[PDB]
Amino acid sequence: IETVPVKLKPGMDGPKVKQWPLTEEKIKALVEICTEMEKEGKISKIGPENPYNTPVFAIKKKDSTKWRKLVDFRELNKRTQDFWPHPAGLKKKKSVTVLDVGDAYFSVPLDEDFRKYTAFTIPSINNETPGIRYQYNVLPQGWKGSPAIFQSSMTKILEPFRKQNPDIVIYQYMDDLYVGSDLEIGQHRTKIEELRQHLLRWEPPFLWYELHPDKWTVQPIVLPEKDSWTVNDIQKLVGKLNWASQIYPGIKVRQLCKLLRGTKALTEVIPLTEEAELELAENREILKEPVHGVYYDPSKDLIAEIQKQGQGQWTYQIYQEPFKNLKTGKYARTNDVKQLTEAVQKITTESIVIWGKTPKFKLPIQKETWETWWTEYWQATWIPEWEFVNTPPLVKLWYQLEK
Amino acid sequence: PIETVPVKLKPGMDGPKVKQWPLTEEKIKALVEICTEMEKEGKISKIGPENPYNTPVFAIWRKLVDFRELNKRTQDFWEVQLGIPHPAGLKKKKSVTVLDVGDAYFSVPLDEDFRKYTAFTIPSINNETPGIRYQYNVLPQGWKGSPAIFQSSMTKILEPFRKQNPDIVIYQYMDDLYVGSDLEIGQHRTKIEELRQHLLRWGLTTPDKKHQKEPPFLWMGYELHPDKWTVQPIVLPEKDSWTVNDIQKLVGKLNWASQIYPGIKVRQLCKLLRGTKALTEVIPLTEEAELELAENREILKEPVHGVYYDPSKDLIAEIQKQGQGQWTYQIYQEPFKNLKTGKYARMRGAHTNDVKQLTEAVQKITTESIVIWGKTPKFKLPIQKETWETWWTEYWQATWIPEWEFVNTPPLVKLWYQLEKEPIVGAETFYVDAGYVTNRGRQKVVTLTDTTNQKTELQAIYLALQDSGLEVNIVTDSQYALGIIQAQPDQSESELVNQIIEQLIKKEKVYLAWVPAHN
Ligand SMILES: CC[C@H]1C(=O)Nc2ccc(F)cc2N1C(=O)OC(C)C
Ligand SMILES: [Mg+2]
Numbered sequence: 001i002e003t004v005p006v007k008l009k010p011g012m013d014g015p016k017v018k019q020w021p022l023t024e025e026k027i028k029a030l031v032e033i034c035t036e037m038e039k040e041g042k043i044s045k046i047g048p049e050n051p052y053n054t055p056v057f058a059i060k061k062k063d064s065t066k067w068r069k070l071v072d073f074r075e076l077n078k079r080t081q082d083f084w085p086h087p088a089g090l091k092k093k094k095s096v097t098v099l100d101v102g103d104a105y106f107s108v109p110l111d112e113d114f115r116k117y118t119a120f121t122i123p124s125i126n127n128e129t130p131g132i133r134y135q136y137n138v139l140p141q142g143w144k145g146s147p148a149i150f151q152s153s154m155t156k157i158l159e160p161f162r163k164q165n166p167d168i169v170i171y172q173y174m175d176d177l178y179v180g181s182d183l184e185i186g187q188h189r190t191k192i193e194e195l196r197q198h199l200l201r202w203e204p205p206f207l208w209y210e211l212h213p214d215k216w217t218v219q220p221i222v223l224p225e226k227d228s229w230t231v232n233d234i235q236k237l238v239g240k241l242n243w244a245s246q247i248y249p250g251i252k253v254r255q256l257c258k259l260l261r262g263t264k265a266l267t268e269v270i271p272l273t274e275e276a277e278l279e280l281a282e283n284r285e286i287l288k289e290p291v292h293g294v295y296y297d298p299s300k301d302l303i304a305e306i307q308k309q310g311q312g313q314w315t316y317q318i319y320q321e322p323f324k325n326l327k328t329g330k331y332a333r334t335n336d337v338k339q340l341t342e343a344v345q346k347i348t349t350e351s352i353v354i355w356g357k358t359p360k361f362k363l364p365i366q367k368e369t370w371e372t373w374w375t376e377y378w379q380a381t382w383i384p385e386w387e388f389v390n391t392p393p394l395v396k397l398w399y400q401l402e403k
Numbered sequence: 404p405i406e407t408v409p410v411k412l413k414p415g416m417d418g419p420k421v422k423q424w425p426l427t428e429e430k431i432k433a434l435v436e437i438c439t440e441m442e443k444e445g446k447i448s449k450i451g452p453e454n455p456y457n458t459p460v461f462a463i464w465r466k467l468v469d470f471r472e473l474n475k476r477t478q479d480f481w482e483v484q485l486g487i488p489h490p491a492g493l494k495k496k497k498s499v500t501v502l503d504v505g506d507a508y509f510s511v512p513l514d515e516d517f518r519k520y521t522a523f524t525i526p527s528i529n530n531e532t533p534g535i536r537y538q539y540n541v542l543p544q545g546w547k548g549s550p551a552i553f554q555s556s557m558t559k560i561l562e563p564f565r566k567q568n569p570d571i572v573i574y575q576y577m578d579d580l581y582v583g584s585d586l587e588i589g590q591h592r593t594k595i596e597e598l599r600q601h602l603l604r605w606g607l608t609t610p611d612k613k614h615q616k617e618p619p620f621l622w623m624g625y626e627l628h629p630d631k632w633t634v635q636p637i638v639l640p641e642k643d644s645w646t647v648n649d650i651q652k653l654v655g656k657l658n659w660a661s662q663i664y665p666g667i668k669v670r671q672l673c674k675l676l677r678g679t680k681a682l683t684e685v686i687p688l689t690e691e692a693e694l695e696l697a698e699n700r701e702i703l704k705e706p707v708h709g710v711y712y713d714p715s716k717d718l719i720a721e722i723q724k725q726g727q728g729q730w731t732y733q734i735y736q737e738p739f740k741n742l743k744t745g746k747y748a749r750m751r752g753a754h755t756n757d758v759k760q761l762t763e764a765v766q767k768i769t770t771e772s773i774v775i776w777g778k779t780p781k782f783k784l785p786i787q788k789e790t791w792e793t794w795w796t797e798y799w800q801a802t803w804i805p806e807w808e809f810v811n812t813p814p815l816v817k818l819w820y821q822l823e824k825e826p827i828v829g830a831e832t833f834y835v836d837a838g839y840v841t842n843r844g845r846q847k848v849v850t851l852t853d854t855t856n857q858k859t860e861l862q863a864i865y866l867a868l869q870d871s872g873l874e875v876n877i878v879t880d881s882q883y884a885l886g887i888i889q890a891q892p893d894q895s896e897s898e899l900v901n902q903i904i905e906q907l908i909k910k911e912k913v914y915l916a917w918v919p920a921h922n
Contacts, residue, residue, distance in 0.1 A: 049478065232916060266826035307799070368770055392882065393889050
């Protein structure tokens with residue numbers, strides 16, 4: 001009755017997603033959590049007439065020893081009707097603390113006719129029992145409609161702090177609230193508390209400590225700078241340059257190329273000629289800045305690829321049209337998978353902060369390994385889209401800072 | 404009674420209206436005695452000729468209703484099972500009783516609003532005698548939602564008994580109720596009687612202790628004892644002429660035994676299927692197929708049991724390389740008491756090395772373990788940490804193996820070669836493009852036949868490797884060949900690649916570089 005009538009996009013039916021198998025530790029955490037959500041009317045056991053399913057997972061958190069239930073609503077989120085802004089001021093604040101306000105949802109009931117689409121299953125070890133089935137009664141954490149539906153109620157609540165602390169940029173995204181302020185880190189955390197407690201007024205633990213958007217400088221392309229240049233060096237250099245010429249057409253190779261005149265031994269040292277020292281120096285300048293004319297339009301998808309740079313280092317880029325990167329960065333400091341998941345999250349927290357959307361990730365990892373271990377390290381409350389790929393050889397070369 | 408699960412027809416669709424085919428008067432009688440009693444039990448009820456719906460019915464006497472139309476119109480239900488347990492995950496019990504649940508679907512109400520779509524018709528003998536129309540009051544055999552609704556009811560009807568008796572394991576499977584415990588013989592038989600009474604007080608009837616199946620329980624291709632498990636009896640056929648069909652069925656059964664019989668091999672056997680033209684075609688057995696067959700029937704002559712999972716103890720998984728692209732493994736808890744075993748041969752990709760392939764076997768085993776035991780085992784592997792890290796750090800894809808211990812049990816896995824990371828000073832340099840030109844003036848233009856733009860870029864390099872000495876620097880314009888060699892395989896589907904690999908293993912130092920077009 002009180003609920004807001006929600007519907008799926010026209011023609012669409014509910015999600016029937018397969019639940020990845022879980023470890024008994026996670027199942028144990030999921031049973032304890034869900035048993036309590038049931039005693040409190042948040043979720044209800046469902047019968048066999050509900051054919052839908054969304055996967056569930058358990059994760060660990062920050063500043064806690066408790067488990068957090070994570071519902072993979074990606075599929076449902078895509079079949080849910082659109083609802084009919086984004087402060088670029090946010091990426092300019094000295095600091096931003098991320099809050100988990102997902103709990104505010106457990107008060108608003110959910111349209112009785114939509115509930116069945118929130119069905120999920122807690123699996124059993126070795127299939128020895130059917131699996132415990134449930135659906136949501138209230139707005140669930142992780143569903144695209146929850147922030148949308150609790151928006152009115154969320155503004156009213158923020159209205160005060162808003163006018164009272166005009167020096168703060170409060171941005172909401174899914175179950176997260178982003179709090180930005182140029183105040184000194186000292187006083188920053190104090191003002192966060194005056195927000196947490198003002199939320200209790202109507203809770204919210206920290207995600208991450210702060211992020212510092214202000215220094216999210218792009219990682220440009222660099223050429224090696226050496227004393228003596230062998231033939232091999234010149235060949236790597238031209239190759240790198242030629243590919244970079246796809247982006248920056250001002251890049252000229254002609255002169256460096258007149259150096260690999262014929263078939264010389266790879267290790268032969270080649271002093272560079274005037275015409276050439278000047279060509280390298282000039283290509284060098286063109287790369288000092290990211291290419292002009294690259295603008296983000298909300299109309300298209302944000303794609304993100306990550307490359308393994310070996311020795312605990314990774315590189316990544318964000319773009320919408322190939323070669324037109326909106327951002328390109330690095331990440332270092334564990335095991336391969338642990339790092340990949342942190343980078344993935346760090347890069348996601350960035351697109352959200354910068355453009356308000358999570359990007360589509362192209363990951364260099366076998367799917368089964370990712371599906372097996374990502375939850376052991378995941379801390380976010382959201383889950384971006386991802387596909388799996390193989391990183392060609394040369395793409396890595398062309399992307400890192402070796403001395 | 405038990406609560407009712409509401410059912411609906413698919414969106415838009417209307418109930419069934421397919422007319423009853425002619426019924427032999429001998430069959431009409433039969434169906435009237437059958438349907439009249441079903442109305443005496445509660446299963447069905449006569450309905451007034453205003454119910455447009457109707458579903459066919461013939462007689463086999465047992466009444467068999469044809470619901471393939473109503474089913475097409477009935478809503479989708481939550482999957483009935485999708486996944487049975489594996490013996491290796493089961494626990495050891497002192498006693499295990501299997502309780503056949505009779506007239507299961509018959510003892511569960513069917514959503515009232517739905518019943519009118521279950522309407523069927525018994526044709527009158529006389530061109531105008533009865534012509535009675537019935538509808539179901541319970542779950543109909545053959546109807547789309549009966550398996551699902553039944554199981555879901557059984558679960559609820561079992562819940563309390565399960566809370567009262569937490570020392571009793573109960574597994575529901577279609578029509579069987581496998582009940583197990585560690586109670587002493589006598590107490591177990593009493594719980595089995597109580598339970599029997601618990602189901603009864605809900606109408607669910609079962610078989611007496613005299614009539615209930617006694618283990619070994621033959622289930623889903625296995626042989627179950629309260630304390631152990633194996634695969635049902637299976638030794639190999641004796642024959643003079645083997646047909647493709649026989650071979651495939653043979654290969655099929657040998658694989659099945661791999662989950663518990665370590666050592667089974669199928670390679671020589673599989674190889675017989677090459678170029679086969681008909682299922683009925685005979686294929687004589689190679690000296691090698693006979694040896695492999697002879698060894699399989701010997702392994703399969705002495706039965707092996709698998710113990711059950713003891714949750715108090717760790718899981719250990721040990722892997723061995725049993726040939727190129729072949730891996731065997733076994734998971735045990737009690738040193739060498741096999742919970743399970745298996746073999747792994749999947750070659751993800753056209754090329755690979757024993758390291759990548761051992762790592763993929765570790766992921767398959769990890770996934771399997773998470774399904775069966777809900778956790779990952781401590782791994783014992785024939786590879787040293789240093790060989791592992793060394794390929795890890797240098798590979799582009801991201802990967803991660805759980806806690807494992809090196810176990811010096813050959814063959815140890817390793818890398819046969821490694822490409823330098825810097826050009827070699829003093830090594831001749833080949834620029835390949837189907838031939839090459841060296842910096843010392845050598846050249847070998849060769850024109851190949853029946854090639855592929857890609858297989859040609861690989862031949863260039865191969866030639867360069869052959870004519871060069873122990874140390875060599877090679878320059879190619881192929882990103883493709885570059886990718887393959889750089890991945891550093893030691894095994895491939897391609898013979899060419901395999902040739903390059905033998906070459907690379909022999910070299911002392913090889914450096915590969917790439918440069919674009921324009922040599
Ligand atoms: C009921 C107890 C349960 C179990 O833990 N161990 C055994 C051991 C021997 C058996 F014959 C059955 C089973 N069990 C089981 O669920 O078997 C289904 C897969 C058929
Ligand atoms: Mg060339």
